[PDB]
Structures are given as C-alpha cells and as structure tokens.
Amino acid sequence: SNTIRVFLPNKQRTVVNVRNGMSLHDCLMKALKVRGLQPECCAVFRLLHEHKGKKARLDWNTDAASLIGEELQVDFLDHVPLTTHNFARKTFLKLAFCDICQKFLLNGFRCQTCGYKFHEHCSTKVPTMCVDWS
Amino acid sequence: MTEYKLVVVGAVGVGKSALTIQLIQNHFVDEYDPTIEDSYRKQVVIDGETCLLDILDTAGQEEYSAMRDQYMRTGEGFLCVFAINNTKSFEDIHHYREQIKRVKDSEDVPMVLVGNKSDLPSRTVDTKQAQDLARSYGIPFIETSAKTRQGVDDAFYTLVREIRKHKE
Ligand SMILES: Nc1nc2c(ncn2[C@@H]2O[C@H](COP(=O)(O)OP(=O)(O)NP(=O)(O)O)[C@@H](O)[C@H]2O)c(=O)[nH]1
Ligand SMILES: [Cl-]
Ligand SMILES: [Cl-]
Ligand SMILES: [Mg+2]
Ligand SMILES: [Zn+2]
Ligand SMILES: [Zn+2]
C-alpha cells in the first residue's frame, strides 16, 4: 500500500516503494537505466483520468510521498533520438565482425536504422533503445 | 512481430530480477532489491525469427496472494526459477506449478524449470533432482547463473521455443 505504480516508456511499467523524502527522480532512476532509458530524455506525468487532457507534467525532484496512491507515467521528451530497433536477416559476403563479441560475423542480423550487426546468440546484448540521429 | 507474454515466478531471493536484468541490459545487479511488479520489453532473435519479449518480473513474496492470479492468466510462458543454494525454493516450485496450472485449466502449460546460482559453492540441490522433476512435469531444465551469464539466453530461448511448439 506504500507504493506507486509508474507506467514506463515503450508500454512498460514498474512499482516502487517510497522511502519518504526521495524524489520522483530518485525512485525511478534505477528502473529507467536498467531498461536502457536515459532519465534526461524523459518526463514524469500524473495521469489525469478526467476530461480535457490525459496527464499533467510534474517536476522530477518533487517529493514522491506527495503522490502515493496516484498512477504516474514516464514518457520520452518531444522528438528525442530514441526509437525501437528494426532487425532483419543479413548475410555478410565481405568479412564482417559482430558489434557485441567482436568475432567473425557470417550469417547474422542488422538493424535497418542504426546498423547494429550481431550474432543471433548476441541479440540479447544489443541495447534496447535505437539511437537515430540521421 | 510476434509478442510473447513471459512471467518469471519463484521464491524470495531466488534470482528472478538478476536474471531478467542480465537478459535486458547485459548487466548484473549484486545488491538485492525486492520486486513488486516490473515489466520489461526487448526484441530478441529466436531461431532466425525476431520477436518481442514482454517479460514480467513478479514478486516472490507471499504478500500478494491476489495480484498473482491476475498476471498468471494473461501470461504465455513461465519461468519457474529456484536457487540451488536454497532447498525450500525447489519444493516451492510445486506451489507455483499448481497455482499457474489452476488458472490455466491445462496440464500442458508452456513452462521451463531453470536452476539459478550455479556458480556458488554452496550447492544443495544437484542436477539429478531437477532433471527428474523436469521429467515429472514434461518441461525442459536449464541450469543458469545470473553473474557468469551461464545459459541465461537458453533459459528464455527454450521458453519461447515451447510456446512455439505449443501453438503449432
Ligand atoms: N552468485 C550468484 N548470486 C546471484 C545470482 N543471481 C542472483 N544472485 C544474487 O542473489 C540475490 C538475487 O536477487 P534477485 O535477483 O533480486 O532475486 P529475486 O528473486 O529477484 N528477489 P525478489 O523476488 O524479492 O524480488 C541478489 O543478491 C543477487 O545479486 C547468481 O546466478 N549467482
Ligand atoms: Cl506507456
Ligand atoms: Cl506483461
Ligand atoms: Mg526480484
Ligand atoms: Zn537500431
Ligand atoms: Zn556476437
């Protein structure tokens, strides 16, 4: 009962207990970094189930105890260069190397947005967010 | 892209969070922090097919004997995880096995019994016990470890493979 559920970007969610005095940034910094999400590229909102607007923006360093019981939501800032990968099969005719284990890559997969090439058994080591500054 | 609803259940301190965090950001968290409800989504390539994994890290605590029945319904695969350093979690697998199969109404539920913390020298449960228990449920067995990353892939990979074998 002493917790707050927060909906995270990319249709994710977390529930954290509030050591009072902690800010919203302190309680959610661990849950964002483990998901490949940069806190500097995120905003925390309070979900408004009411009319005319679904959420209102909140300060990151506000007291987390002041929002116990409500449902918060973290979203990416406007037009941040973070998206989801777009993998596809690729056979490397010329000798290429994996971006994860730095071994010989023959039949692997590459992202059509950032160019992340990797062995299939290394696809779990690719970052979860796609950085796109093209 | 095909999504797979995955649910990781187990006892307290078994290693459910350390396994998913190593699967998600290729990292290992040493200091222990209990899970209440954590959802993760990541694209993983399984047998040449790039699919999305909606992993749900659940609470091993018995304080949530109500929300457990909810997410066990909408889940497609289940990771029955236990630590070989604790023999109470090995027998508690039957409780998680029967409670999931109850809200599934099917003896054939896509699960895989995995054994974590294989790097510790304080091994209490050997492979002979888990291999026969895996034969008792008809599910594969994967010996894992969150630190050395021993077969952390093959745990989630074989779980999605059973979901694929279960469908068609
Ligand atoms: N040596 C070793 N330690 C591990 C391994 N996996 C987890 N641990 C450690 O044992 C504990 C497991 O913590 P955690 O993964 O949070 O377990 P949990 O099942 O997630 N806990 P909870 O259910 O309460 O949320 C932590 O101290 C972690 O660092 C492993 O494979 N080897
Ligand atoms: Cl969301
Ligand atoms: Cl889910
Ligand atoms: Mg946990
Ligand atoms: Zn990419
Ligand atoms: Zn590789």
Residue numbers in the entry:
A (entry chain B): 55 to 188
B (entry chain A): 1 to 168
Quote what the paper states about this structure.
The interaction of membrane-bound active RAS with RAF is the first step in the activation of this pathway. The N-terminal CR1 region contains the RAS-binding domain (RBD) and the cysteine-rich domain (CRD), the CR2 region contains a 14-3-3 recognition site, whereas the C-terminal CR3 region includes the kinase domain and a second binding site for 14-3-3 proteins.
We were able to obtain well-diffracting crystals of G12V, G13D, and Q61R mutants of KRAS complexed with RAF1(RBDCRD) and solved their structures in the resolution range between 2.11–2.87 Å. Since the mutant structures belong to the same crystal form as the WT KRAS-RBDCRD structure obtained in crystal form II, we used this structure to examine any structural changes in KRAS and at KRAS-RBDCRD interfaces. A closer examination of the switch regions of KRAS shows minor conformational changes in the structures of oncogenic mutants complexed with RBDCRD when compared with WT KRAS-RBDCRD structure. In the KRAS G12V-RBDCRD structure, KRAS residue Y32 adopts a different rotameric conformation to accommodate the side chain of Val at position 12. The side chain of R61 in the KRAS Q61R-RBDCRD structure points towards the KRAS-RBD interface and occupies an empty space surrounded by KRAS residues Y64, P34, and I36, therefore not impacting the KRAS-RBD interface.
